[PDB]
């Protein structure tokens, strides 16, 4: 339909993808580093979620260079997405209420 509305949803599908590839890539990068805890897929997915939302509790975090780079991408994707939905809600509210005048 509307650009902003489409870009938002596209941002959401893209998010889910980054979340999954994030889980895969994180484990791939962290495994091999002594003491690393981001080493099994199920928890790595939960790590990805709390990173993308930025709640970073943490209970798990990358410690290798590539794990951190993967973390940086997930952070930005999550922030961009959640930020692309706010702009879509602002476009909807503005354009709309503009009629209520």
């Amino acid at each position, epitope marked *: 339909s509307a650009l902003h509305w489409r870009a938002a949803g596209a941002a959401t599908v893209l998010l889910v993808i980054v979340l999954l590839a994030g889980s*895969y890539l994180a*484990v*791939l990068a*962290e*495994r*091999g*580093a*002594p*003491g*690393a*805890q981001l*080493i*099994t*897929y*199920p928890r790595a997915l939960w790590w990805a979620c709390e990173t993308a939302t930025t709640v970073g509790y943490x209970d798990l975090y990358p410690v290798t260079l590539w794990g951190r780079l993967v973390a940086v991408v997930v952070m930005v994707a999550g922030i961009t997405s959640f930020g692309l939905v706010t702009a879509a809600l602002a476009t909807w509210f503005v354009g709309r209420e503009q009629e209520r005048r």
Partner: antibody
Amino acid sequence: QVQLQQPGAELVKPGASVKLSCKASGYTFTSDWIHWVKQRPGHGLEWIGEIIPSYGRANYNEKIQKKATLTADKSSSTAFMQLSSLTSEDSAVYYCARERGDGYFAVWGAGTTVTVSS
Amino acid sequence: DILLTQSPAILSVSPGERVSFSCRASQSIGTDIHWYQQRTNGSPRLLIKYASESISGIPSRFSGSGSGTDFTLSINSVESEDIANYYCQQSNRWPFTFGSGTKLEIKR
């Protein structure tokens, strides 16, 4: 159907080299890691290393000399471990096991008995 | 690198009794512990995963408990087929590691 198939035994002369194999069956996912565990007679289990076939990357135990090199062949679904410059010390039973990226070893191979003698 | 300690190394029990093996982690690992069985001339067999979760195809006799650094694998009423070597393994931190081992022995 036996999930992992390994040659029953291998003989190697000191200083020589042998390449063990492990053919897998059943379901196969991108999240599969194949591990190699070494067991000397009368003793316990010793993690040697791991490899992720879908990507081809492997990691090895730092607390021990690196006699092994891991490789994988996607087409024939076989994982190989190249043991080099052996000695009586490298003589034991080598297992391969599969892990679904969740931390435990679901299934093991029968194990390949390796002997280093002249 | 997490050090898993299993003591004692040999456990002797009377048929039908209740036996308990213990694993000691050198640092908190949650419940990221798993147990294996290896009979003579055999290969390891997963018995319990994640400290408590039961595996499919394993007698309801086998159970596990613990969290942090202290874990226990129990057998309610042990029997002959249980004579073997039990090992624990952690997946909390890299690299995965194995316990030294515990042998179960029956006194008939």
